Amino acid sequence: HCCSAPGGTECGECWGAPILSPEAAKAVAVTLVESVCPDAAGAELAWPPEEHARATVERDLRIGRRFREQPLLFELLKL
């Protein structure tokens, strides 16, 4: 209800589905990243190579622990 832009104009014929606002979902993703892992050493959008994953294993393990302790995060990803 918060992210869906208004909304209520009877789109389509009878199956109008409101789209999600990109700004609201972007803010949700940003605050989720800030709450899960506030680190910024490798926060670049470009995916590093595979061997690079052998240096930040502690951050990945803490992210996995945060995901396993609270499943709601997964639901937030679905948003």
Partner: protein, 534 residues
């Protein structure tokens, strides 16, 4: 002699990409430098000293009369806490290196400047990147403070000395990956405030960026330790008169490299006397310079000098030999050299040597000649008139060479100045007393600082205690050191210990051992009636 300067400041607590702080990396680099220098069969006479960024009474950790054990013990327990006081620490290190100089005879300032009386010393000054603080803000000039000069230091006007090189390590290790590994064999400069201070002394400043680069710079630094003879060259005044095989056009002018004066103590004669005209009556002596401003002139001027003159082999370290190599290393020819700043009564420079190369054309031999060789080498009342152009005190060393032939001179005119001899023994005694006072309170810290300073905001005199690290509570002797939890069990333990009446009782509950447990140390205090003859 090597004096390692490790700041141990609060800015050296940031963690590298490997997982250790910059202080741990610096200590590991020092240990690997030790194990690398131990490979060369010449580390049996050197002495290691340690200097940190602490108060003058606490800056020095291991100085004179300190073996390797206490040095390693002090470097082991280094704690990074404090500001980056680079100037005061460098001043303290230079004063520590110049404690036993005015007593043995080095830099006497009255009888020439002997280059064979060397006291080598190399500083590493391992510090952080930048942003040094002085308890008020962040400076960007790095000026050495002058608050309490040592007695007899106004005759050099510079903190460093004839043989005191200064290398630097900044340890600019990234935190994420340190993936900068493009240039394999290339060690750039740090480009910081310590770079000019290092370049003035005669040593470069490395810029550590990766552990591989750290190993490279450490393996390149071990090859830069030898006898310290640093002299400065200038192009003036010949306008690059190198018209021998090509046309001149250069950066190889202000060469401030060192020279390897290998012994065969060092053996040699004919030193660079001074740069001024000394008078017979001079109460105040002009301050000397750590680097002599000596200039060379490109002239052939009969480079063949063969005589019974005592020979010298002060090898010059190749740093600006490109200008000589451009002229085919000047085969069978040389160029004169002369010291500036009124070398005589009324003239600008007097040629006293040349820079003739060897037959192998490898390096420059630095042939040091007498004050004026082309006249005395080729008596009809000639030497008596010729000995008036040379400085008076200079008749000291040369006469020794005349001892190889005869003895026509005497002690009649062997006097430098009636006022130069005065006010010299008192300065030497003061320097000796200062060196003794510095070497006395070198390891005894005696901080005794544990208080909270409770402010008002029994009155005006209360101060809460702090947590003591090495407290060693006596549980059996003192009853206040027994907490409430384990009180009854400890009571029964003390009762059984007192009612046992054993031998060699102690007051410690459980004192296992110290950090080190040597096998030979424990096996020595024993008796084994066996020899294994079979």
């Amino acid at each position: 002699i090597l004096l390692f300067l490790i700041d141990t400041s609060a800015s050296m607590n940031q963690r590298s990409h490997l997982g250790t702080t910059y202080l741990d990396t610096a200590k590991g680099a020092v240990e690997t430098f030790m194990k690398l220098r131990a490979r060369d069969p010449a580390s049996r006479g050197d002495r290691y000293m340690l200097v940190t960024f602490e108060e003058p009474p606490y800056a020095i950790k291991a100085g004179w009369k300190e073996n390797h054990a206490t040095f390693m013990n002090e470097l082991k327990n280094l704690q990074a806490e404090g500001l980056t006081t680079l100037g005061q620490s460098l001043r303290t290190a230079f004063d520590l290196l110049n404690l036993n100089r005015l007593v043995t005879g080095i830099d006497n300032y009255g009888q020439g400047r002997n280059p064979f009386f060397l006291e080598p010393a190399i500083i590493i000054t391992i510090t952080d990147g930048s942003k040094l603080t002085t308890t008020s803000g962040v400076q960007d000039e790095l000026h050495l403070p002058l608050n309490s000069p040592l007695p007899g230091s106004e005759l050099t006007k510079e903190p460093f000395r004839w043989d005191q090189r200064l290398f630097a390590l900044v340890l600019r290790l990234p935190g994420t990956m340190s993936v900068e590994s493009e240039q394999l064999t290339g060690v750039p400069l740090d480009d910081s405030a310590i770079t000019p201070m290092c370049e003035v002394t005669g040593g470069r400043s490395y810029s550590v960026c990766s552990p591989r680069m750290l190993n490279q710079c450490l393996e390149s630094l071990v090859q830069k330790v030898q006898s310290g003879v640093v002299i400065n060259f200038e192009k003036a005044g010949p306008d690059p008169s190198p018209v021998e095989d090509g046309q001149p056009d250069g950066s190889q002018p202000w060469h401030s490299c060192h020279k390897l004066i290998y012994v065969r103590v060092p053996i040699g004669h004919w030193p660079v006397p001074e740069s001024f005209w000394p008078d017979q009556n001079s109460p105040t002596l002009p301050p000397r310079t750590s680097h002599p401003v000596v200039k060379f002139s490109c002239t052939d001027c009969e480079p063949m000098v063969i005589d019974k003159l005592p020979f010298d082999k002060y090898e010059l370290e190749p740093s600006p030999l490109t200008q000589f190599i451009l002229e085919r290393k000047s085969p069978q020819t040389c160029w004169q050299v002369y010291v500036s700043n009124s070398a005589k009564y009324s003239e600008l420079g007097h040629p006293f040597g040349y820079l003739k190369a060897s037959t192998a054309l490898n390096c420059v031999n630095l042939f040091v000649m007498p004050y004026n060789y082309p006249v005395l080498l080729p008596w009809r009342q000639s030497f008596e008139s010729y000995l008036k152009t040379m400085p008076p005190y200079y008749l000291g060393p040369l006469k020794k060479a005349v001892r190889m032939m005869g003895a026509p001179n005497l002690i009649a005119d062997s006097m430098e100045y009636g006022l130069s001899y005065s006010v010299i023994s008192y300065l030497k005694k003061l320097s000796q007393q200062a060196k003794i006072e510095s070497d006395r309170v070198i390891g005894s810290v005696g901080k005794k600082v544990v208080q909270e300073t409770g402010i008002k905001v029994e009155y005006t005199g209360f101060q809460v205690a702090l947590l003591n690290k090495d407290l060693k509570p006596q549980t059996f002797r003192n009853a206040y050191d027994i907490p409430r939890r384990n009180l009854l069990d400890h009571l029964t333990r003390m009762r059984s210990n007192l009612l046992k009446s054993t031998r060699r009782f102690l007051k410690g509950q459980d004192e296992d051992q110290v950090h080190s447990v040597p096998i030979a140390q424990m096996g020595n205090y024993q008796e084994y009636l066996k020899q294994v003859p079979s």
